[PDB]
PDB file of C-alpha atoms in Angstrom:
ATOM      1  CA  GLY V   9      84.370 -42.529 136.194  1.00 37.19           C
ATOM      2  CA  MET V  10      84.698 -45.264 138.806  1.00 33.65           C
ATOM      3  CA  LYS V  11      88.144 -44.009 139.873  1.00 34.01           C
ATOM      4  CA  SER V  12      88.230 -43.216 143.596  1.00 37.99           C
ATOM      5  CA  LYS V  13      88.552 -39.506 144.401  1.00 35.35           C
ATOM      6  CA  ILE V  14      91.848 -38.896 146.174  1.00 39.40           C
ATOM      7  CA  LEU V  15      92.589 -36.141 148.691  1.00 35.23           C
ATOM      8  CA  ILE V  16      96.253 -35.457 149.421  1.00 35.16           C
ATOM      9  CA  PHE V  17      97.761 -33.457 152.292  1.00 32.95           C
ATOM     10  CA  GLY V  18     101.371 -32.295 152.028  1.00 36.95           C
ATOM     11  CA  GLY V  19     101.144 -32.520 148.258  1.00 35.42           C
ATOM     12  CA  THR V  20     103.733 -29.763 147.759  1.00 36.92           C
ATOM     13  CA  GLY V  21     106.143 -31.672 149.982  1.00 35.66           C
ATOM     14  CA  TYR V  22     109.175 -33.673 148.873  1.00 35.98           C
ATOM     15  CA  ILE V  23     107.484 -37.058 148.545  1.00 38.28           C
ATOM     16  CA  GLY V  24     103.994 -35.594 148.398  1.00 38.91           C
ATOM     17  CA  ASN V  25     104.364 -34.070 144.948  1.00 35.44           C
ATOM     18  CA  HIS V  26     105.110 -37.527 143.534  1.00 38.77           C
ATOM     19  CA  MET V  27     101.906 -38.884 145.022  1.00 38.51           C
ATOM     20  CA  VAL V  28      99.975 -36.016 143.440  1.00 40.37           C
ATOM     21  CA  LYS V  29     101.571 -36.655 140.039  1.00 41.14           C
ATOM     22  CA  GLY V  30     101.082 -40.402 140.377  1.00 42.42           C
ATOM     23  CA  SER V  31      97.426 -39.948 141.286  1.00 41.14           C
ATOM     24  CA  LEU V  32      96.798 -37.826 138.202  1.00 40.02           C
ATOM     25  CA  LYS V  33      98.808 -40.126 135.929  1.00 41.15           C
ATOM     26  CA  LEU V  34      96.579 -42.984 137.081  1.00 41.57           C
ATOM     27  CA  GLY V  35      93.450 -41.020 136.163  1.00 43.71           C
ATOM     28  CA  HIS V  36      92.235 -40.370 139.706  1.00 42.58           C
ATOM     29  CA  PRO V  37      90.310 -37.185 140.476  1.00 46.96           C
ATOM     30  CA  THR V  38      92.925 -35.467 142.642  1.00 45.79           C
ATOM     31  CA  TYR V  39      92.361 -32.915 145.406  1.00 48.97           C
ATOM     32  CA  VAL V  40      95.365 -31.061 146.822  1.00 52.66           C
ATOM     33  CA  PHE V  41      94.882 -29.292 150.158  1.00 52.25           C
ATOM     34  CA  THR V  42      97.498 -26.582 150.600  1.00 52.76           C
ATOM     35  CA  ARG V  43      98.212 -23.520 152.746  1.00 50.11           C
ATOM     36  CA  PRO V  44      97.009 -20.090 151.554  1.00 50.84           C
ATOM     37  CA  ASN V  45     100.543 -18.731 151.993  1.00 49.77           C
ATOM     38  CA  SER V  46     102.331 -20.935 149.503  1.00 50.44           C
ATOM     39  CA  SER V  47     105.921 -20.458 148.419  1.00 51.80           C
ATOM     40  CA  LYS V  48     105.266 -23.319 145.995  1.00 53.84           C
ATOM     41  CA  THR V  49     103.133 -21.383 143.540  1.00 52.25           C
ATOM     42  CA  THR V  50     104.939 -22.847 140.526  1.00 51.54           C
ATOM     43  CA  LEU V  51     104.360 -26.402 141.735  1.00 51.63           C
ATOM     44  CA  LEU V  52     100.648 -25.776 142.313  1.00 50.35           C
ATOM     45  CA  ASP V  53     100.145 -24.362 138.807  1.00 52.77           C
ATOM     46  CA  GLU V  54     101.765 -27.488 137.379  1.00 54.10           C
ATOM     47  CA  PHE V  55      99.426 -29.668 139.439  1.00 59.01           C
ATOM     48  CA  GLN V  56      96.518 -27.595 138.148  1.00 60.10           C
ATOM     49  CA  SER V  57      97.617 -27.883 134.512  1.00 63.98           C
ATOM     50  CA  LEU V  58      97.686 -31.653 135.079  1.00 63.55           C
ATOM     51  CA  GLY V  59      94.100 -31.758 136.325  1.00 60.99           C
ATOM     52  CA  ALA V  60      94.440 -31.413 140.107  1.00 62.20           C
ATOM     53  CA  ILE V  61      91.828 -29.532 142.129  1.00 60.26           C
ATOM     54  CA  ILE V  62      93.637 -27.098 144.419  1.00 61.88           C
ATOM     55  CA  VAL V  63      92.056 -26.426 147.812  1.00 61.90           C
ATOM     56  CA  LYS V  64      93.585 -23.651 149.888  1.00 64.77           C
ATOM     57  CA  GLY V  65      93.192 -23.651 153.639  1.00 61.36           C
ATOM     58  CA  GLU V  66      94.687 -24.420 157.029  1.00 57.15           C
ATOM     59  CA  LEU V  67      94.486 -27.721 158.920  1.00 59.47           C
ATOM     60  CA  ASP V  68      92.780 -25.737 161.679  1.00 57.93           C
ATOM     61  CA  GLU V  69      89.706 -25.244 159.512  1.00 57.04           C
ATOM     62  CA  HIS V  70      87.835 -28.254 160.889  1.00 55.46           C
ATOM     63  CA  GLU V  71      84.544 -27.478 159.133  1.00 55.25           C
ATOM     64  CA  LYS V  72      86.252 -27.017 155.769  1.00 55.90           C
ATOM     65  CA  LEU V  73      88.066 -30.350 156.225  1.00 56.47           C
ATOM     66  CA  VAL V  74      84.844 -32.194 157.049  1.00 57.13           C
ATOM     67  CA  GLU V  75      82.996 -30.816 154.021  1.00 60.36           C
ATOM     68  CA  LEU V  76      85.988 -31.720 151.873  1.00 59.17           C
ATOM     69  CA  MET V  77      86.217 -35.276 153.241  1.00 58.69           C
ATOM     70  CA  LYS V  78      82.577 -35.820 152.289  1.00 60.37           C
ATOM     71  CA  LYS V  79      83.473 -35.266 148.636  1.00 61.07           C
ATOM     72  CA  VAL V  80      86.328 -37.789 148.426  1.00 61.20           C
ATOM     73  CA  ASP V  81      87.016 -41.491 148.992  1.00 60.20           C
ATOM     74  CA  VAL V  82      90.702 -41.812 149.810  1.00 59.81           C
ATOM     75  CA  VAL V  83      92.924 -39.647 151.997  1.00 58.93           C
ATOM     76  CA  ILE V  84      96.715 -39.698 151.835  1.00 58.92           C
ATOM     77  CA  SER V  85      98.853 -37.640 154.210  1.00 57.80           C
ATOM     78  CA  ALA V  86     102.446 -36.731 153.333  1.00 54.42           C
ATOM     79  CA  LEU V  87     103.028 -34.148 156.073  1.00 57.02           C
ATOM     80  CA  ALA V  88     106.548 -33.498 157.392  1.00 60.06           C
ATOM     81  CA  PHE V  89     107.964 -34.529 160.773  1.00 62.44           C
ATOM     82  CA  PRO V  90     107.052 -31.210 162.469  1.00 64.76           C
ATOM     83  CA  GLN V  91     103.389 -31.840 161.615  1.00 62.36           C
ATOM     84  CA  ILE V  92     103.030 -35.519 162.571  1.00 60.99           C
ATOM     85  CA  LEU V  93     100.553 -34.978 165.401  1.00 62.74           C
ATOM     86  CA  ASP V  94      98.732 -32.309 163.377  1.00 60.41           C
ATOM     87  CA  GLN V  95      97.406 -35.292 161.416  1.00 60.49           C
ATOM     88  CA  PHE V  96      94.956 -35.677 164.291  1.00 60.45           C
ATOM     89  CA  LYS V  97      93.183 -32.704 162.726  1.00 60.17           C
ATOM     90  CA  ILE V  98      92.886 -34.682 159.497  1.00 61.27           C
ATOM     91  CA  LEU V  99      91.786 -37.772 161.421  1.00 63.78           C
ATOM     92  CA  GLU V 100      89.107 -35.853 163.322  1.00 63.95           C
ATOM     93  CA  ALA V 101      87.589 -34.675 160.027  1.00 65.64           C
ATOM     94  CA  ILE V 102      87.713 -38.212 158.614  1.00 66.08           C
ATOM     95  CA  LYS V 103      85.923 -39.482 161.730  1.00 66.75           C
ATOM     96  CA  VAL V 104      83.166 -36.875 161.448  1.00 67.48           C
ATOM     97  CA  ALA V 105      82.719 -37.254 157.662  1.00 65.76           C
ATOM     98  CA  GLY V 106      82.466 -41.038 157.960  1.00 66.61           C
ATOM     99  CA  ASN V 107      82.666 -41.810 154.228  1.00 65.60           C
ATOM    100  CA  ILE V 108      86.422 -42.323 153.795  1.00 65.61           C
ATOM    101  CA  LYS V 109      87.296 -45.721 152.307  1.00 65.09           C
ATOM    102  CA  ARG V 110      91.036 -45.642 153.007  1.00 67.05           C
ATOM    103  CA  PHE V 111      93.439 -43.437 154.963  1.00 68.35           C
ATOM    104  CA  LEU V 112      97.223 -43.578 154.531  1.00 70.71           C
ATOM    105  CA  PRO V 113      99.020 -41.637 157.291  1.00 70.60           C
ATOM    106  CA  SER V 114     102.377 -39.988 156.693  1.00 67.93           C
ATOM    107  CA  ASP V 115     104.730 -42.923 157.178  1.00 65.44           C
ATOM    108  CA  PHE V 116     106.596 -43.636 153.914  1.00 65.49           C
ATOM    109  CA  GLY V 117     109.866 -44.571 155.590  1.00 65.54           C
ATOM    110  CA  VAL V 118     110.907 -47.193 158.127  1.00 63.82           C
ATOM    111  CA  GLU V 119     108.368 -49.660 159.536  1.00 67.56           C
ATOM    112  CA  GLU V 120     108.084 -47.983 162.953  1.00 67.78           C
ATOM    113  CA  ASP V 121     106.043 -50.787 164.517  1.00 65.91           C
ATOM    114  CA  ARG V 122     108.937 -53.251 164.201  1.00 66.24           C
ATOM    115  CA  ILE V 123     112.071 -51.129 164.584  1.00 67.35           C
ATOM    116  CA  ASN V 124     113.485 -48.783 167.229  1.00 70.19           C
ATOM    117  CA  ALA V 125     115.902 -45.897 166.767  1.00 71.57           C
ATOM    118  CA  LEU V 126     118.061 -43.534 168.797  1.00 76.81           C
ATOM    119  CA  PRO V 127     116.057 -41.077 170.968  1.00 75.60           C
ATOM    120  CA  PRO V 128     116.229 -38.187 168.468  1.00 75.11           C
ATOM    121  CA  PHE V 129     114.493 -40.204 165.745  1.00 75.35           C
ATOM    122  CA  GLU V 130     112.577 -42.541 168.073  1.00 73.80           C
ATOM    123  CA  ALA V 131     110.533 -39.620 169.440  1.00 73.70           C
ATOM    124  CA  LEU V 132     109.379 -38.843 165.901  1.00 74.98           C
ATOM    125  CA  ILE V 133     108.478 -42.386 164.876  1.00 78.76           C
ATOM    126  CA  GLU V 134     106.657 -42.791 168.178  1.00 78.85           C
ATOM    127  CA  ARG V 135     104.445 -39.897 167.075  1.00 79.57           C
ATOM    128  CA  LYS V 136     103.765 -41.803 163.852  1.00 81.67           C
ATOM    129  CA  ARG V 137     102.784 -44.845 165.946  1.00 84.96           C
ATOM    130  CA  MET V 138     100.339 -42.711 167.932  1.00 85.44           C
ATOM    131  CA  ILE V 139      98.547 -41.886 164.692  1.00 85.57           C
ATOM    132  CA  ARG V 140      98.390 -45.559 163.731  1.00 85.16           C
ATOM    133  CA  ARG V 141      97.010 -46.507 167.148  1.00 83.49           C
ATOM    134  CA  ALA V 142      94.309 -43.833 166.813  1.00 86.16           C
ATOM    135  CA  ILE V 143      93.341 -45.089 163.350  1.00 86.05           C
ATOM    136  CA  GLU V 144      93.012 -48.685 164.557  1.00 86.09           C
ATOM    137  CA  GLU V 145      91.051 -47.740 167.665  1.00 87.72           C
ATOM    138  CA  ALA V 146      88.512 -45.932 165.465  1.00 89.33           C
ATOM    139  CA  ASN V 147      88.353 -48.789 162.952  1.00 88.96           C
ATOM    140  CA  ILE V 148      89.246 -46.402 160.112  1.00 89.34           C
ATOM    141  CA  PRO V 149      90.211 -48.354 156.959  1.00 93.62           C
ATOM    142  CA  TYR V 150      93.936 -47.889 156.386  1.00 91.98           C
ATOM    143  CA  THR V 151      97.166 -48.823 154.673  1.00 92.41           C
ATOM    144  CA  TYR V 152     100.545 -48.269 156.315  1.00 92.69           C
ATOM    145  CA  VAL V 153     103.277 -47.709 153.744  1.00 95.57           C
ATOM    146  CA  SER V 154     106.930 -48.411 154.515  1.00 95.63           C
ATOM    147  CA  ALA V 155     108.665 -47.014 151.425  1.00 97.34           C
ATOM    148  CA  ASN V 156     112.152 -47.389 152.876  1.00100.21           C
ATOM    149  CA  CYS V 157     114.891 -45.023 151.596  1.00102.67           C
ATOM    150  CA  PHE V 158     114.085 -42.244 149.108  1.00104.92           C
ATOM    151  CA  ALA V 159     116.625 -43.080 146.369  1.00105.05           C
ATOM    152  CA  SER V 160     117.298 -39.742 144.660  1.00105.56           C
ATOM    153  CA  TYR V 161     117.494 -38.117 148.076  1.00106.70           C
ATOM    154  CA  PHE V 162     120.057 -40.539 149.457  1.00109.77           C
ATOM    155  CA  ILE V 163     122.015 -41.115 146.272  1.00110.92           C
ATOM    156  CA  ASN V 164     122.500 -37.332 146.387  1.00110.54           C
ATOM    157  CA  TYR V 165     123.270 -37.372 150.097  1.00110.02           C
ATOM    158  CA  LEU V 166     125.668 -40.343 150.049  1.00110.68           C
ATOM    159  CA  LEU V 167     127.406 -39.953 146.684  1.00112.90           C
ATOM    160  CA  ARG V 168     127.174 -36.150 146.328  1.00114.85           C
ATOM    161  CA  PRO V 169     127.335 -36.668 142.526  1.00114.16           C
ATOM    162  CA  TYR V 170     127.360 -32.899 142.034  1.00114.77           C
ATOM    163  CA  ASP V 171     130.581 -32.679 144.078  1.00114.19           C
ATOM    164  CA  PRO V 172     133.936 -33.151 142.285  1.00110.90           C
ATOM    165  CA  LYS V 173     135.561 -34.217 145.582  1.00116.29           C
ATOM    166  CA  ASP V 174     138.035 -37.116 145.747  1.00117.23           C
ATOM    167  CA  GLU V 175     136.720 -38.485 149.042  1.00117.49           C
ATOM    168  CA  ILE V 176     133.400 -39.995 150.081  1.00119.40           C
ATOM    169  CA  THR V 177     132.016 -40.206 153.605  1.00119.72           C
ATOM    170  CA  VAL V 178     130.922 -43.620 154.865  1.00118.47           C
ATOM    171  CA  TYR V 179     128.739 -43.878 157.959  1.00118.55           C
ATOM    172  CA  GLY V 180     129.790 -46.692 160.240  1.00115.25           C
ATOM    173  CA  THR V 181     131.481 -49.659 158.567  1.00120.15           C
ATOM    174  CA  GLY V 182     129.237 -49.151 155.553  1.00117.41           C
ATOM    175  CA  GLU V 183     128.304 -52.840 155.589  1.00119.17           C
ATOM    176  CA  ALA V 184     124.677 -52.372 156.663  1.00124.97           C
ATOM    177  CA  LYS V 185     122.122 -53.199 153.974  1.00125.45           C
ATOM    178  CA  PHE V 186     119.297 -50.851 153.063  1.00125.32           C
ATOM    179  CA  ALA V 187     116.595 -50.653 150.412  1.00125.37           C
ATOM    180  CA  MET V 188     116.075 -47.504 148.381  1.00125.14           C
ATOM    181  CA  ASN V 189     113.296 -46.696 145.946  1.00126.33           C
ATOM    182  CA  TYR V 190     112.833 -43.994 143.296  1.00124.41           C
ATOM    183  CA  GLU V 191     110.534 -41.222 144.522  1.00125.33           C
ATOM    184  CA  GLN V 192     108.438 -41.294 141.349  1.00126.14           C
ATOM    185  CA  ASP V 193     107.800 -45.018 141.870  1.00124.21           C
ATOM    186  CA  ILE V 194     107.003 -44.523 145.555  1.00126.48           C
ATOM    187  CA  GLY V 195     104.339 -42.083 144.459  1.00126.75           C
ATOM    188  CA  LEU V 196     102.870 -44.350 141.797  1.00123.20           C
ATOM    189  CA  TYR V 197     102.771 -47.524 143.902  1.00122.86           C
ATOM    190  CA  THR V 198     101.300 -45.612 146.830  1.00120.69           C
ATOM    191  CA  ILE V 199      98.300 -44.546 144.759  1.00122.81           C
ATOM    192  CA  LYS V 200      97.920 -48.094 143.437  1.00121.18           C
ATOM    193  CA  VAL V 201      97.885 -49.765 146.850  1.00120.96           C
ATOM    194  CA  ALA V 202      95.560 -47.104 148.287  1.00121.65           C
ATOM    195  CA  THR V 203      92.776 -48.526 146.117  1.00119.66           C
ATOM    196  CA  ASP V 204      93.986 -52.141 146.079  1.00117.71           C
ATOM    197  CA  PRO V 205      91.879 -54.498 148.270  1.00118.63           C
ATOM    198  CA  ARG V 206      94.971 -56.617 148.864  1.00121.18           C
ATOM    199  CA  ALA V 207      96.360 -53.689 150.871  1.00122.04           C
ATOM    200  CA  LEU V 208      93.237 -52.917 152.927  1.00122.07           C
ATOM    201  CA  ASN V 209      94.179 -52.611 156.613  1.00118.63           C
ATOM    202  CA  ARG V 210      97.658 -53.936 155.998  1.00116.52           C
ATOM    203  CA  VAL V 211     101.283 -52.881 156.144  1.00117.63           C
ATOM    204  CA  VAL V 212     102.714 -52.540 152.631  1.00117.38           C
ATOM    205  CA  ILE V 213     106.501 -52.527 152.265  1.00117.44           C
ATOM    206  CA  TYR V 214     108.439 -51.419 149.173  1.00116.11           C
ATOM    207  CA  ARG V 215     111.437 -53.749 149.007  1.00116.85           C
ATOM    208  CA  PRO V 216     112.180 -54.761 145.419  1.00114.97           C
ATOM    209  CA  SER V 217     115.029 -57.305 145.255  1.00111.59           C
ATOM    210  CA  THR V 218     116.888 -55.105 142.753  1.00110.99           C
ATOM    211  CA  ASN V 219     117.085 -52.188 145.188  1.00109.94           C
ATOM    212  CA  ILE V 220     118.898 -53.694 148.186  1.00109.77           C
ATOM    213  CA  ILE V 221     122.490 -52.599 148.734  1.00107.11           C
ATOM    214  CA  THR V 222     125.142 -51.356 151.176  1.00108.22           C
ATOM    215  CA  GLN V 223     126.992 -48.022 151.211  1.00108.97           C
ATOM    216  CA  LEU V 224     130.191 -49.719 150.039  1.00109.34           C
ATOM    217  CA  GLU V 225     128.506 -51.550 147.146  1.00112.01           C
ATOM    218  CA  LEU V 226     126.725 -48.352 146.082  1.00107.81           C
ATOM    219  CA  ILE V 227     130.064 -46.543 146.037  1.00110.40           C
ATOM    220  CA  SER V 228     131.741 -49.328 144.030  1.00109.87           C
ATOM    221  CA  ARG V 229     128.968 -49.347 141.440  1.00108.49           C
ATOM    222  CA  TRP V 230     129.043 -45.544 141.133  1.00109.98           C
ATOM    223  CA  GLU V 231     132.822 -45.585 140.668  1.00108.91           C
ATOM    224  CA  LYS V 232     132.429 -47.975 137.743  1.00107.74           C
ATOM    225  CA  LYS V 233     129.651 -45.865 136.214  1.00108.29           C
ATOM    226  CA  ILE V 234     131.675 -42.648 136.159  1.00106.47           C
ATOM    227  CA  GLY V 235     135.193 -44.075 135.977  1.00109.20           C
ATOM    228  CA  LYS V 236     136.559 -42.496 139.151  1.00110.00           C
ATOM    229  CA  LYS V 237     137.830 -43.855 142.476  1.00110.21           C
ATOM    230  CA  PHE V 238     137.134 -42.174 145.816  1.00111.08           C
ATOM    231  CA  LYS V 239     138.996 -42.249 149.117  1.00110.70           C
ATOM    232  CA  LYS V 240     136.563 -43.644 151.694  1.00112.01           C
ATOM    233  CA  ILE V 241     136.384 -41.739 154.986  1.00109.95           C
ATOM    234  CA  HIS V 242     134.435 -43.517 157.729  1.00112.73           C
ATOM    235  CA  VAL V 243     132.491 -41.939 160.593  1.00114.20           C
ATOM    236  CA  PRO V 244     132.505 -44.387 163.568  1.00115.49           C
ATOM    237  CA  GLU V 245     129.175 -45.485 165.024  1.00116.55           C
ATOM    238  CA  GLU V 246     130.168 -44.514 168.563  1.00116.56           C
ATOM    239  CA  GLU V 247     130.896 -41.130 167.034  1.00118.10           C
ATOM    240  CA  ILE V 248     127.467 -40.803 165.423  1.00117.24           C
ATOM    241  CA  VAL V 249     125.802 -42.000 168.633  1.00117.97           C
ATOM    242  CA  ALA V 250     127.644 -39.391 170.725  1.00115.20           C
ATOM    243  CA  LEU V 251     126.559 -36.582 168.388  1.00114.60           C
ATOM    244  CA  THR V 252     122.901 -37.539 168.812  1.00115.00           C
ATOM    245  CA  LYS V 253     123.400 -36.903 172.531  1.00110.41           C
ATOM    246  CA  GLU V 254     125.324 -33.627 172.344  1.00109.71           C
ATOM    247  CA  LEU V 255     124.072 -31.829 169.219  1.00112.20           C
ATOM    248  CA  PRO V 256     120.864 -29.757 169.538  1.00107.86           C
ATOM    249  CA  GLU V 257     117.544 -30.360 167.789  1.00106.51           C
ATOM    250  CA  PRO V 258     116.754 -30.606 164.923  1.00105.43           C
ATOM    251  CA  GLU V 259     120.478 -30.984 164.152  1.00104.03           C
ATOM    252  CA  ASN V 260     120.786 -34.411 165.801  1.00 96.44           C
ATOM    253  CA  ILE V 261     117.780 -35.855 163.992  1.00 92.33           C
ATOM    254  CA  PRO V 262     119.424 -36.414 160.571  1.00 95.40           C
ATOM    255  CA  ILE V 263     122.338 -38.013 162.421  1.00 95.24           C
ATOM    256  CA  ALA V 264     119.961 -40.372 164.241  1.00 91.57           C
ATOM    257  CA  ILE V 265     118.290 -41.227 160.935  1.00 92.10           C
ATOM    258  CA  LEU V 266     121.654 -41.929 159.283  1.00 91.94           C
ATOM    259  CA  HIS V 267     122.431 -44.348 162.099  1.00 92.03           C
ATOM    260  CA  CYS V 268     119.047 -46.032 161.816  1.00 91.89           C
ATOM    261  CA  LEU V 269     119.227 -46.506 158.038  1.00 92.47           C
ATOM    262  CA  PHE V 270     122.931 -46.980 157.351  1.00 94.75           C
ATOM    263  CA  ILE V 271     124.418 -48.432 160.535  1.00 94.65           C
ATOM    264  CA  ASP V 272     121.571 -50.333 162.186  1.00 95.85           C
ATOM    265  CA  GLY V 273     120.265 -51.216 158.717  1.00 95.85           C
ATOM    266  CA  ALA V 274     116.669 -50.811 159.869  1.00 93.99           C
ATOM    267  CA  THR V 275     115.103 -51.168 156.407  1.00 96.75           C
ATOM    268  CA  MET V 276     116.545 -54.681 156.014  1.00 98.85           C
ATOM    269  CA  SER V 277     116.845 -55.874 159.630  1.00 99.04           C
ATOM    270  CA  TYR V 278     113.638 -57.911 159.524  1.00 98.85           C
ATOM    271  CA  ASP V 279     111.861 -60.689 157.645  1.00100.32           C
ATOM    272  CA  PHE V 280     108.337 -60.265 156.298  1.00 99.29           C
ATOM    273  CA  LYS V 281     105.371 -61.131 158.507  1.00 97.19           C
ATOM    274  CA  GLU V 282     102.409 -63.273 157.456  1.00 99.86           C
ATOM    275  CA  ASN V 283     100.183 -60.292 156.729  1.00 99.03           C
ATOM    276  CA  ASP V 284     102.895 -58.074 155.244  1.00 99.69           C
ATOM    277  CA  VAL V 285     102.446 -57.084 151.604  1.00 94.76           C
ATOM    278  CA  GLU V 286     105.611 -56.419 149.586  1.00 95.02           C
ATOM    279  CA  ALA V 287     104.510 -54.036 146.830  1.00 97.16           C
ATOM    280  CA  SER V 288     106.793 -55.088 143.955  1.00 98.46           C
ATOM    281  CA  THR V 289     104.899 -58.397 143.826  1.00 95.18           C
ATOM    282  CA  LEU V 290     101.511 -56.731 143.305  1.00 98.01           C
ATOM    283  CA  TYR V 291     101.511 -55.493 139.711  1.00100.30           C
ATOM    284  CA  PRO V 292     102.924 -57.388 136.702  1.00100.39           C
ATOM    285  CA  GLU V 293     102.529 -54.294 134.503  1.00100.23           C
ATOM    286  CA  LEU V 294     104.807 -52.204 136.719  1.00 98.00           C
ATOM    287  CA  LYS V 295     108.255 -52.511 138.262  1.00 98.62           C
ATOM    288  CA  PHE V 296     110.380 -50.381 140.590  1.00 99.49           C
ATOM    289  CA  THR V 297     113.218 -48.502 138.869  1.00104.19           C
ATOM    290  CA  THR V 298     116.334 -50.514 139.777  1.00104.17           C
ATOM    291  CA  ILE V 299     119.554 -49.284 141.373  1.00105.33           C
ATOM    292  CA  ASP V 300     121.417 -49.596 138.067  1.00106.11           C
ATOM    293  CA  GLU V 301     118.734 -47.587 136.287  1.00105.48           C
ATOM    294  CA  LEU V 302     118.882 -45.002 139.086  1.00101.24           C
ATOM    295  CA  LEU V 303     122.644 -44.642 138.684  1.00103.35           C
ATOM    296  CA  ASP V 304     122.135 -44.192 134.944  1.00104.05           C
ATOM    297  CA  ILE V 305     119.673 -41.382 135.611  1.00104.74           C
ATOM    298  CA  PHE V 306     122.236 -39.626 137.796  1.00101.71           C
ATOM    299  CA  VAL V 307     124.853 -40.021 135.071  1.00107.90           C
ATOM    300  CA  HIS V 308     122.604 -38.640 132.316  1.00107.34           C
ATOM    301  CA  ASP V 309     120.134 -36.278 134.009  1.00107.98           C
ATOM    302  CA  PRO V 310     120.632 -36.209 137.810  1.00108.80           C
ATOM    303  CA  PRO V 311     117.916 -34.651 140.016  1.00109.78           C
ATOM    304  CA  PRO V 312     118.699 -31.843 142.538  1.00108.65           C
ATOM    305  CA  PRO V 313     119.590 -32.724 146.155  1.00108.93           C
ATOM    306  CA  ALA V 314     117.050 -32.141 148.928  1.00110.34           C
ATOM    307  CA  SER V 315     116.817 -31.805 152.712  1.00112.39           C
ATOM    308  CA  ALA V 316     113.837 -32.967 154.807  1.00111.42           C
ATOM    309  CA  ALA V 317     112.348 -30.597 157.394  1.00112.33           C
ATOM    310  CA  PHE V 318     112.849 -31.234 161.109  1.00110.83           C
TER     311      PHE V 318
END
């Protein structure tokens, strides 16, 4: 009915599929633009069975993009790091169409306009800033989402719950704080703020108070949940830093990200600004799945590990 029509790019991606599912769950007409040569045919069918309108094509099809933009109201991009600047193709279509009410570029991580990282990762977030600068210069309505750490992804990466090993790797001292949110919630809240006036032309950060922790505390809580103790093996910062200088690309990128998130503590190294919007405060009918609840999920029905593209 009055629900805004949502167009999603990168819908078959790691975080993108949660935005597609969240959009549909919220009753929004959902358009999913995806490549003709899809290896995610089983994910697309699911989207379709849920009500999504699948649109096959390439980002290079400018005319197709423009005609598509004219049919929707909101555009959300969840493209991967290798395609950050390709979002300029999406932006060009938005500019020509002229009817888009809100554009959310592919951020969904650290708040790049207030943090810096090691060269490997800095080059990537600088590309994300370029997109933001282009959006602002064109006066395109937007929302910049800083979703912080993807919880299932990093619980898998840090705790390796599927690994019966007796040791656990700690990056740096392990004392740096970070915030991590459940992917399903990131998807749901993202759709909500994309149509929320309180988020128009603002930076929205997902930092629920129940999802802030350090590597050491996460380990301790996991140990209590499963009744096992692990031998902690640390990886010195100077060591991680060196690797980002010697290892090739994209190898050194994950290492740079690990330093940013778990050593520098970039997701918790700042205080909120006047115009910042912290998402957990927006909806009294919803709440972010907490860290304890997340650990319970991994104990009862843990999700498969994943690896972002670089």
